[PDB]
Amino acid sequence: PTTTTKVDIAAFDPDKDGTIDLKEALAAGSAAFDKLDPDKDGTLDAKELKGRVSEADLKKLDPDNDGTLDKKEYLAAVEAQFKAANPDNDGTIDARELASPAGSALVNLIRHHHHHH
């Protein structure tokens, strides 16, 4: 199914070599701002995150007070929430540390969602 399954940590740790190290989290952010976006700006809003997040949560995620994220910030809010999704430790995350168990935080910056099957 491709586009619909380019969709989690499970698109950048299908390997479970051990974890996502930051290079694979970076690859999850770049994948996610692509498949999130139907107005075609990668600048990420109350109808991009349609049913994903409240318009109040939408203005949590961003740093520079747009009220919304960017192709810069679905690539940087991910990395700012990277260490925090792990309860411990330094610079690595297994799916147990991410995929809506223990890291259900950082999910909001890399899970996106699509419009289809």
The answer on whether 13 is annotated among ligand-binding residues is yes
Selected from 15, 23, 56, 117, the binder of Y ion by CB under 5 A is: 15
Residue carrying structure tokens 């925090």: 84
**Which window, 32-40, 74-82, 85-93, 101-109, contacts Y ion (CB under 5 A)?**
32-40
State the nearest-atom distance from the C-beta of 45 to Y ion, in Å: 4
Give the residue from 115, 91, 116, 96 showing the smallest Cα distance to 10. 96
The answer on whether 68 is annotated among ligand-binding residues is yes
DSSP strand pairing (20-21 vs 92-93)? antiparallel
Residue carrying structure tokens 């619909």: 4
**CB 81, CB 24: distance < 8 Å:** no
Binding of Y ion by 23 (CB under 5 A): no
**Which window, 2-10, 17-25, 51-59, 107-115, contacts Y ion (CB under 5 A)?**
17-25
The answer on whether 90 is annotated among ligand-binding residues is yes
- How far apart are alpha carbons 16 and 22 in whole angstroms? 14
Selected from 70, 95, 110, 112, the binder of Y ion by CB under 5 A is: 70
Residues 6+ positions from 30 with CB-CB distance below 8 Å = 75
Binding site for Nd(3+), residues?
A: 13, 15, 17, 19, 24, 37, 39, 41, 43, 48, 62, 64, 66, 68, 73, 86, 88, 90, 92, 97
